[PDB]
Amino acid sequence: SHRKFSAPRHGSLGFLPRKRSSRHRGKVKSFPKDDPSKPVHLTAFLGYKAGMTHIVREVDRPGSKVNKKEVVEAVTIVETPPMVVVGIVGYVETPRGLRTFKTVFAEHISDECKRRFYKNWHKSKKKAFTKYCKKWQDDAGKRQLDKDFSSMKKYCQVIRVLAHTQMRLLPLRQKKAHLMEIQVNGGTVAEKLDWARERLEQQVPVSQVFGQDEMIDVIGVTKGKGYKGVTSRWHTKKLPRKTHRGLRKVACIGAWHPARVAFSVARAGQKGYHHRTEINKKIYKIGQGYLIKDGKLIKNNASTDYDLSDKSINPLGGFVHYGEVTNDFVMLKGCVVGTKKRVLT
Amino acid sequence: MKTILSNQTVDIPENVDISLKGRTVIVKGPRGTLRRDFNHINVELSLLGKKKKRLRVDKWWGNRKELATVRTICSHVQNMIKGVTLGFRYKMRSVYAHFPINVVIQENGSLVEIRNFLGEKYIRRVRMRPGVACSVSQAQKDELVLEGNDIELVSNSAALIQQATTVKNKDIRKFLDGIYVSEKGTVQQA
Amino acid sequence: QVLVLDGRGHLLGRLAAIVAKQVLLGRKVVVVRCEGINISGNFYRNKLKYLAFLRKRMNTNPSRGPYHFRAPSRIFWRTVRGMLPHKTKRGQAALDRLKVFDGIPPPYDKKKRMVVPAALKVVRLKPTRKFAYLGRLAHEVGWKYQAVTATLEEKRKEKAKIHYRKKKQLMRLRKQAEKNVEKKIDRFTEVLKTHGFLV
RNA sequence: GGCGAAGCUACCAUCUGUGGGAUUAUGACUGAACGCCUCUAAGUCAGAAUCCCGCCCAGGCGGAACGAUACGGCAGCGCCGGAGCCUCGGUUGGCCUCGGAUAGCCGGUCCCCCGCGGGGUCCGGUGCGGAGAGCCCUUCGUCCCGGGAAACGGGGCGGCCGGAAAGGGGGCCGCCCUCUCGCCCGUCACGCACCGCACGUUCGUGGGGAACCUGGCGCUAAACCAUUCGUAGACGACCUGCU
RNA sequence: CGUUCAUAGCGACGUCGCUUUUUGAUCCUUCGAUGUCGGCUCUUCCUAUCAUUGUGAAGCAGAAUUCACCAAGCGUUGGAUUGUUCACCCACUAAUAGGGAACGUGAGCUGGGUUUAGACCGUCGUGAGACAGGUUAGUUUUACCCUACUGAUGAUGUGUUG
RNA sequence: GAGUGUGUAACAACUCACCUGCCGAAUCAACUAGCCCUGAAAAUGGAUGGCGCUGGAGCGUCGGGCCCAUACCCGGCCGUC
RNA sequence: UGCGAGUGCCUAGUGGGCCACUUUUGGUAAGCAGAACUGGCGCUGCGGGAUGAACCGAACGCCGGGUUAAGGCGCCCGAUG
């Protein structure tokens, strides 16, 4: 028979593979579309969820009831240390996909960046890139890569740059840096790569990437919640108290002629630790980190043009379960995906 | 019935110089050139007569689905001859009841915006076809003028601005509003 | 010993009829430029035959259901799969002998492409009928890569232009040769033309 | 029984939720059929909670690029340059490329004009003979001489270019060294002539493993378990640290 | 009929078809058992489309409201009574459209009334008892096996790993 | 046309049927038979058997050629009569 | 026209049938119920109709060659390549 009262579907039909993510770093699945009109710049960046706080600000939108009055606003503090560029990679479009062409790594690679290529840093002999780095100081090695750079300028279409974060400027316990390729959007391929050639083994701050009141997206991994029931994995209706086999389960699954339980039927399983791409997040303040000219500059971290205080964004006792922020930061409107100390893209 | 032959001469004037790359006929003259490929009709195009006095088209062993394509070959050709000699002028009269329709061109005639149509706040940006020039007439308060050489491009742009001024969920028989075709003419009458 | 078949201008099932029988006889055939196969009927007909194929999915688990391939190579690979006994071991070893590609692989860019006169549009279809390309139809089903293929096929097309121009440059030198040497090869030419050569 | 850190939690607090393509229905343009007219017959336009793609999730008995590749007290590897011996199977010359039209093509000089390419004109074919009803090589061999072809050619180490969609044993300069042997016509003989009896004849230094060989060049680790971490977790698994 | 006007909307007297969401007809499957009604929860599908998207026609002046088309993407409620499927009413709403999946769904739940054994009332029967008349109380067993699915290890090849 | 339409208290007035001015070959009307379309809407995704097919691999009428069943002929063997 | 005929004893099993060309009863109709002749399945394999009670052909000891019925000859799949 037909259903008596119609009801919307519990749970989304777009997020069926609710598995634990095979990766821990947030991954950019789709970079912004290229256009040879704007100058070269970055497109993605790696951050860490530090904590959350309030913003009292003036909303000046026309036509609202909140016109010319103040609100409080939950934001998220993301400590965003500057990158170290340690290589570039080229991509060429194929009928079978978008295949990479060549990877060129930098000469001097930081030890934090070298921790990524090892599953056991203590027992390793740290022999990574010991012979590759000998292809730079020699004239034959430099000529061997000079044509390699020119090979990218002729055959490659999409140029992505390899950058990693710094664990030396963070309160994190871990020291293994996170690598991610970042697509460079600009004009033609030739001068776009030459910008990355000049910016090798350099420091990339956040102001080169993002600016004031930018309207950006957040990529991260959900806070894992373990193996949860179907009444919390899908928020289904709880069965009444008089049930014998339990009341936190889906009562009827399917019909007799094969509705042999489908992918669309809500079942118990893993809840949390899912890769999510949540978009439309407004930046309110790109921060400036700790810097000393003669004295310590805690003054200009959480000071506005009306506050005039010496407070930093670190609360009394510091951020809970994260540490104390020392570097420049990005403050994102609203809550973001992931727990504390989570690698956010 | 498969008719053995179906023929019609196309008498062209002396001031038009035409050529053909197989079935792709090129018509040029005073007001410019016109190119229109005549493929997928499966008929031949024979340009006979010295000093190019006429064009002849035949169809061998055809039935009534492509007997009807014989005359549309000539009819497209004469419009190319007419569009090069005298052009195509489609005057575009605007009809309104209460709210006057304000029409003005932007680049040369390419972009035409329609405003104060039924008092609508939504402006209507309509692009013309390439090679079609638009302008506002004189000696009368509101009428639009479309110029060009190709009959298909000019009249499609006229239908674009005719279908842009349509009334929604009202009585069409009472709300006689919008811009409509007034006359189908040429740039000069010779 | 390996056939290279140009896919442009061929019917879908007519070329598959020739290919599938030749595969089962133990002879490798390579079908290339699979965006060029065209299908009889108007375009809006063949779209709904293959769009209704997209609706053919198993309700309980579409992941193990029918794999709706979107590239024109695998669409042509699909229609040969149904015409071969792929459930047996002879059929499975037959599909290894069939290599089907979109565009022009650089493996086969300098190979001469065979044409089957039993499957061409002009010889099989009436000139007044309508036909629909598989390359245009595949893009509207979800095949993304027609702009990448068109840029690469345009690059392959002009690369063969210099080679053909060099082939004509060598051919006029081939033709120029017997016009100054015929006074000493006139004892070797008639023995070819009294046995039916060079006429 | 109050209050309550941290952690979970509520539309019971808060944040976010997207851009294109084709067209359906429809309204049309040109326009015959049916010298008139018509959205239709060829063709063309607009066209949506429709369909599909983009956004987002997983990532295939699917590929790609890069790094390190076992100095130890042995050993073991990688690249390049000789004979036997197991297994696996088909195999019996290669064709090294225009695009495209089908009521239409091919190749030229270009007296002519634009930036070797294009257009007009002119010339010979068009069941294709600048033919895949087709092209190249053809192997029984060696020994002397004469005739046709060559003298600018065969063969024997470094520099310079063209190739990326899954990348070509391709072209040019010579040399310290060897020929009128290579291939086309004719004299002259020889080669176990195995006495009629079948898997003969190549791509075959074919792919994989075992150990012997001679010489040269270059190498020095990684993963897992154990412990810790707790951004994770039923257990596995995942993120970390540890002279 | 529709103020005149058959076809805007309708349409008698006649006539042609579709459906198994009704009752029928048959006994073809099962009586070495396929758990027999509803309600709750949940998944999917159909269009004979209630509303929303796009449209055409109205006895379409506007508004409101009817007829028709592509169209199942998204929705179709809270409650009083009754075990109810149904049914009626109140309020909100864009609408509160119709259905299928062994008349979906009992090793998912309940047992409310059908349908055991105890009883009471009314009718019938001399009687034991009968009533598809009414009321009351009346045990809802097992997955650890295979498959499907949810998650979690892995495996196949890339000489080994990242 | 003692008249088909427009407007007057009725007139006045215009226009249609019809005829003439120009053009030059088949046209019109009603039935009837084939192929195709509408009529033609159900629930797991769905079936000329599938792939596919449109100078058919769709339909009708046919002509050669070709395939095989334990069917027929010939031959070998067994058994029964 | 063709076939060697007649006759006497015991005797198992069967006594639920079904389908089809044609005729035909009741029923709107039914893969419904009930009759006549004939042929089949039951009891029977084989080729074909994709699949299969009853449809077409054709009935069967074990094999080789040849040829066909009904069906077919784009591929699956033998054959109009």
Coordinates of N, CA and C (backbone and C1' of nucleotides) in Angstrom, one line a residue, chain A residues 1-10 16 18-20 116-117 119 227 233 237 242-245 250-252 254-257 260-262 264-265 267-270, chain E residues 35 38-44 74-78 85-86 98-111 141-143 148-153 161-162:
Chain A
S1 N 0.8 -1.2 0.0 CA 0.0 0.0 0.0 C 0.9 1.3 0.0
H2 N 0.2 2.4 -0.2 CA 0.9 3.7 -0.2 C 1.1 4.2 1.2
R3 N 2.1 5.1 1.4 CA 2.3 5.7 2.7 C 1.2 6.6 3.0
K4 N 0.8 6.6 4.3 CA -0.4 7.3 4.7 C -0.1 8.8 4.7
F5 N 0.9 9.3 5.4 CA 1.3 10.7 5.5 C 2.7 10.8 4.9
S6 N 2.8 11.7 3.9 CA 4.1 11.9 3.2 C 5.0 12.6 4.1
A7 N 6.3 12.4 3.9 CA 7.4 12.9 4.8 C 8.6 13.1 4.0
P8 N 9.4 14.1 4.2 CA 10.7 14.2 3.6 C 11.7 13.1 4.0
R9 N 12.7 12.9 3.1 CA 13.7 11.9 3.4 C 14.6 12.3 4.5
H10 N 14.9 11.4 5.5 CA 15.9 11.7 6.5 C 17.3 11.5 5.9
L16 N 26.2 9.7 0.6 CA 26.1 8.3 1.0 C 27.5 7.7 1.5
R18 N 29.6 7.5 3.8 CA 29.9 8.1 5.1 C 31.0 7.2 5.8
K19 N 32.1 7.1 5.1 CA 33.3 6.4 5.6 C 34.3 7.4 6.2
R20 N 35.2 6.8 7.0 CA 36.3 7.6 7.5 C 37.2 8.0 6.4
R116 N 57.3 14.5 6.1 CA 56.2 13.9 5.4 C 56.5 12.6 4.7
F117 N 57.7 12.5 4.1 CA 58.1 11.3 3.3 C 58.6 10.2 4.2
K119 N 57.5 7.4 7.4 CA 56.5 6.9 8.4 C 57.1 6.7 9.8
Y227 N 31.5 5.0 15.9 CA 30.4 4.2 15.4 C 29.2 4.6 16.1
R233 N 23.2 9.0 13.4 CA 23.8 9.1 12.1 C 22.9 9.6 11.1
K237 N 13.4 9.0 13.4 CA 12.4 9.0 14.5 C 12.6 7.9 15.5
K242 N 7.3 1.1 24.1 CA 6.7 -0.3 24.3 C 7.4 -1.3 23.3
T243 N 8.5 -0.9 22.6 CA 9.2 -1.8 21.7 C 10.0 -2.8 22.5
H244 N 10.1 -4.0 21.9 CA 10.7 -5.1 22.5 C 12.2 -5.3 22.1
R245 N 12.5 -5.1 20.8 CA 13.8 -5.2 20.2 C 14.6 -4.0 20.3
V250 N 15.7 1.9 13.0 CA 14.7 2.1 11.9 C 13.8 0.9 12.0
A251 N 12.5 1.2 12.1 CA 11.5 0.1 12.3 C 11.3 -0.8 11.1
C252 N 10.8 -0.2 10.0 CA 10.6 -0.9 8.7 C 11.7 -0.5 7.8
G254 N 12.1 -2.2 4.3 CA 11.6 -2.2 2.9 C 10.5 -3.2 2.7
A255 N 10.1 -3.4 1.4 CA 9.0 -4.3 1.0 C 9.5 -5.7 0.9
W256 N 8.5 -6.6 0.5 CA 8.8 -8.0 0.4 C 9.4 -8.3 -0.9
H257 N 8.7 -8.0 -2.0 CA 9.4 -8.1 -3.3 C 10.6 -7.1 -3.3
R260 N 15.5 -5.2 -1.2 CA 16.7 -5.8 -0.5 C 17.6 -4.7 -0.2
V261 N 17.7 -4.4 1.1 CA 18.0 -3.0 1.7 C 18.9 -2.2 0.8
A262 N 18.4 -1.0 0.5 CA 19.0 -0.2 -0.5 C 20.1 0.7 0.1
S264 N 19.8 3.8 -0.1 CA 19.0 5.0 0.4 C 18.4 4.7 1.7
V265 N 18.5 3.5 2.2 CA 17.9 3.1 3.5 C 18.9 3.5 4.6
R267 N 21.0 3.2 7.7 CA 21.6 2.2 8.6 C 22.6 2.8 9.6
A268 N 22.8 2.1 10.6 CA 23.9 2.5 11.6 C 25.3 2.3 11.0
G269 N 26.2 3.1 11.4 CA 27.5 3.1 10.9 C 28.4 4.2 11.4
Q270 N 29.5 4.5 10.7 CA 30.4 5.5 11.1 C 29.8 6.9 10.9
Chain E
rG35 P 6.0 -17.9 7.3 O5' 4.7 -17.6 8.1 C5' 4.0 -16.3 7.9 C4' 2.7 -16.3 8.7 C3' 1.9 -15.0 8.7 O3' 1.1 -14.8 7.5 C1' 2.1 -15.9 10.9
rG38 P -5.1 -4.0 6.6 O5' -5.8 -2.8 7.5 C5' -5.0 -1.8 8.0 C4' -5.5 -1.3 9.4 C3' -4.6 -0.3 10.1 O3' -4.7 1.0 9.6 C1' -5.2 -2.0 11.6
rG39 P -3.5 1.8 8.9 O5' -2.8 2.7 10.0 C5' -3.7 3.4 10.9 C4' -3.1 3.5 12.3 C3' -1.6 3.9 12.3 O3' -1.4 5.3 12.3 C1' -1.9 1.9 13.6
rC40 P -0.2 5.9 11.4 O5' 1.1 5.6 12.2 C5' 1.2 6.1 13.6 C4' 2.5 5.6 14.2 C3' 3.8 5.8 13.4 O3' 4.3 7.1 13.6 C1' 3.7 3.6 14.3
rU41 P 5.0 7.8 12.4 O5' 6.3 6.9 12.2 C5' 7.4 7.0 13.1 C4' 8.5 6.1 12.7 C3' 9.0 6.3 11.3 O3' 10.0 7.3 11.1 C1' 8.6 4.0 11.7
rC42 P 10.0 8.2 9.8 O5' 10.8 7.3 8.8 C5' 12.1 6.8 9.0 C4' 12.4 5.6 8.1 C3' 12.2 5.9 6.6 O3' 13.3 6.6 6.1 C1' 11.2 3.9 7.2
rU43 P 13.0 7.6 4.8 O5' 13.3 6.7 3.6 C5' 14.5 5.9 3.5 C4' 14.4 4.9 2.4 C3' 13.8 5.3 1.1 O3' 14.7 6.0 0.3 C1' 12.8 3.2 1.7
rU44 P 14.2 7.2 -0.7 O5' 13.6 6.3 -2.0 C5' 14.4 5.4 -2.7 C4' 13.6 4.4 -3.5 C3' 12.7 5.0 -4.5 O3' 13.3 5.5 -5.7 C1' 11.6 3.3 -3.3
rC74 P 12.7 14.5 -5.2 O5' 12.1 15.8 -4.5 C5' 13.0 16.8 -4.0 C4' 12.2 18.0 -3.6 C3' 11.1 17.7 -2.6 O3' 11.5 17.6 -1.3 C1' 10.3 19.2 -4.3
rG75 P 10.7 16.7 -0.2 O5' 9.7 17.7 0.5 C5' 8.5 17.2 1.1 C4' 7.4 18.3 1.0 C3' 6.0 17.7 1.3 O3' 5.7 17.7 2.7 C1' 5.9 19.1 -0.7
rU76 P 5.3 16.3 3.4 O5' 3.7 16.3 3.3 C5' 3.0 17.4 3.7 C4' 1.7 17.6 2.9 C3' 0.8 16.3 2.8 O3' 0.0 16.2 4.0 C1' 1.1 17.3 0.7
rU77 P 0.1 14.9 5.0 O5' 0.4 15.6 6.4 C5' 1.6 16.1 6.8 C4' 1.5 17.2 7.8 C3' 0.8 16.9 9.1 O3' 1.6 16.2 10.0 C1' 0.1 19.0 8.2
rG78 P 0.8 15.3 11.1 O5' 0.3 16.4 12.2 C5' 1.2 17.2 12.9 C4' 0.5 18.1 13.9 C3' -0.5 17.5 14.8 O3' 0.0 16.9 15.9 C1' -1.5 19.3 13.8
rU85 P -8.0 4.4 10.1 O5' -8.2 3.5 8.8 C5' -7.2 2.5 8.4 C4' -7.6 1.9 7.1 C3' -8.2 2.7 6.1 O3' -7.2 3.5 5.4 C1' -9.4 0.7 6.2
rC86 P -7.6 5.0 4.9 O5' -9.0 4.8 4.2 C5' -10.0 5.8 4.4 C4' -11.4 5.2 4.2 C3' -12.5 6.2 4.3 O3' -12.7 7.0 3.1 C1' -13.1 4.3 5.6
rG98 P -5.5 12.4 -1.4 O5' -5.6 11.2 -2.5 C5' -6.7 11.1 -3.3 C4' -6.4 10.1 -4.5 C3' -5.8 8.8 -4.1 O3' -6.8 7.9 -3.6 C1' -4.7 9.6 -5.9
rG99 P -6.5 6.8 -2.5 O5' -5.9 5.6 -3.3 C5' -4.6 5.0 -3.0 C4' -3.9 4.5 -4.2 C3' -2.8 3.5 -4.0 O3' -3.3 2.2 -3.7 C1' -2.0 5.1 -5.5
rG100 P -2.6 1.2 -2.7 O5' -1.4 0.5 -3.5 C5' -1.7 -0.1 -4.7 C4' -0.4 -0.5 -5.5 C3' 0.6 -1.2 -4.7 O3' 0.4 -2.6 -4.6 C1' 1.7 0.6 -5.8
rA101 P 0.7 -3.4 -3.3 O5' 2.3 -3.6 -3.3 C5' 2.9 -4.3 -4.4 C4' 4.4 -4.1 -4.4 C3' 5.1 -4.5 -3.1 O3' 5.4 -5.9 -3.0 C1' 5.8 -2.4 -3.8
rA102 P 5.1 -6.6 -1.6 O5' 3.5 -6.7 -1.6 C5' 2.8 -7.5 -2.6 C4' 2.0 -8.6 -2.0 C3' 2.0 -8.7 -0.4 O3' 0.7 -9.2 0.0 C1' 2.7 -10.8 -1.4
rC103 P 0.0 -8.4 1.2 O5' -1.2 -7.6 0.5 C5' -0.9 -6.6 -0.5 C4' -2.0 -5.5 -0.6 C3' -2.2 -4.8 0.7 O3' -1.3 -3.8 1.0 C1' -4.3 -5.4 -0.3
rG104 P -0.5 -3.8 2.4 O5' 1.0 -3.6 1.9 C5' 1.6 -4.4 0.9 C4' 3.1 -4.5 1.0 C3' 3.6 -4.7 2.4 O3' 3.6 -6.1 2.7 C1' 4.8 -2.9 1.4
rU105 P 3.0 -6.7 4.1 O5' 4.2 -6.3 5.2 C5' 5.5 -6.7 5.0 C4' 6.4 -5.8 5.8 C3' 6.1 -5.7 7.3 O3' 6.7 -6.7 8.0 C1' 6.4 -3.5 6.3
rG106 P 5.8 -7.9 8.5 O5' 5.5 -7.6 10.1 C5' 6.5 -7.1 10.9 C4' 6.5 -7.8 12.2 C3' 6.9 -9.3 12.2 O3' 8.3 -9.5 12.2 C1' 5.0 -8.9 13.6
rA107 P 8.9 -10.8 11.4 O5' 10.2 -11.2 12.3 C5' 10.2 -11.0 13.7 C4' 11.4 -11.6 14.4 C3' 12.7 -10.9 14.1 O3' 12.9 -9.7 14.7 C1' 12.9 -13.3 14.0
rG108 P 13.9 -8.6 14.1 O5' 13.2 -7.9 12.9 C5' 11.8 -7.5 13.0 C4' 11.7 -6.2 13.7 C3' 10.5 -6.0 14.6 O3' 10.6 -6.6 15.9 C1' 10.8 -4.1 13.2
rC109 P 9.3 -7.3 16.5 O5' 8.6 -6.1 17.3 C5' 9.3 -5.2 18.1 C4' 8.5 -4.0 18.5 C3' 7.1 -4.2 19.0 O3' 7.1 -4.5 20.4 C1' 7.0 -2.6 17.3
rU110 P 6.0 -5.5 21.1 O5' 4.6 -4.7 20.9 C5' 4.4 -3.5 21.7 C4' 3.0 -3.0 21.3 C3' 1.9 -4.0 21.6 O3' 1.4 -3.9 22.9 C1' 1.6 -2.9 19.5
rG111 P 1.1 -5.2 23.7 O5' -0.3 -5.7 23.1 C5' -1.4 -4.8 23.2 C4' -2.5 -5.2 22.2 C3' -3.2 -6.5 22.4 O3' -4.6 -6.4 22.2 C1' -2.3 -6.4 20.2
rU141 P 8.0 -12.4 20.2 O5' 8.5 -14.0 20.4 C5' 8.7 -14.5 21.8 C4' 9.4 -15.8 21.7 C3' 10.7 -15.7 20.9 O3' 11.8 -15.2 21.6 C1' 9.5 -17.6 20.3
rU142 P 12.8 -14.2 20.9 O5' 13.8 -15.1 20.1 C5' 14.7 -16.1 20.8 C4' 15.5 -16.9 19.8 C3' 16.2 -16.1 18.7 O3' 17.5 -15.7 19.2 C1' 15.0 -17.9 17.7
rA143 P 18.0 -14.2 18.7 O5' 18.8 -14.5 17.3 C5' 19.8 -15.5 17.2 C4' 20.4 -15.5 15.9 C3' 21.1 -14.3 15.4 O3' 22.5 -14.2 15.9 C1' 19.7 -15.0 13.7
rA148 P 26.0 -10.2 -1.2 O5' 24.8 -9.3 -1.0 C5' 23.9 -8.9 -2.0 C4' 22.8 -8.0 -1.5 C3' 23.3 -6.7 -0.8 O3' 23.6 -5.7 -1.8 C1' 21.7 -7.7 0.6
rC149 P 25.0 -4.9 -1.7 O5' 24.8 -3.8 -0.5 C5' 23.6 -3.0 -0.6 C4' 23.3 -2.4 0.8 C3' 24.4 -1.8 1.6 O3' 24.7 -0.4 1.2 C1' 23.2 -3.2 3.0
rU150 P 26.1 0.2 1.4 O5' 26.2 0.5 2.9 C5' 25.3 1.4 3.6 C4' 25.5 1.4 5.1 C3' 26.9 1.6 5.6 O3' 27.3 3.0 5.5 C1' 25.9 -0.1 6.8
rG151 P 28.4 3.4 4.4 O5' 29.6 4.0 5.2 C5' 30.8 3.2 5.5 C4' 30.8 2.8 7.0 C3' 32.1 2.2 7.4 O3' 33.1 3.2 7.7 C1' 30.4 0.8 8.2
rA152 P 34.5 3.1 6.9 O5' 35.3 1.9 7.6 C5' 35.4 1.9 9.1 C4' 36.2 0.7 9.5 C3' 37.4 0.3 8.6 O3' 38.5 1.1 8.9 C1' 36.1 -1.6 9.0
rU153 P 39.7 1.1 7.9 O5' 40.6 -0.1 8.4 C5' 41.3 -1.0 7.5 C4' 41.4 -2.4 8.1 C3' 42.4 -3.3 7.5 O3' 43.7 -3.0 8.0 C1' 40.4 -4.5 7.7
rU161 P 55.3 -2.5 -1.1 O5' 55.9 -1.8 0.2 C5' 55.3 -0.7 0.8 C4' 56.2 0.3 1.2 C3' 55.7 1.8 1.1 O3' 54.9 2.1 2.2 C1' 57.9 1.7 0.2
rG162 P 53.4 2.8 2.0 O5' 53.7 4.3 2.1 C5' 54.5 4.9 3.1 C4' 55.2 6.1 2.7 C3' 54.3 7.2 2.0 O3' 53.6 7.9 2.9 C1' 56.4 6.9 0.8

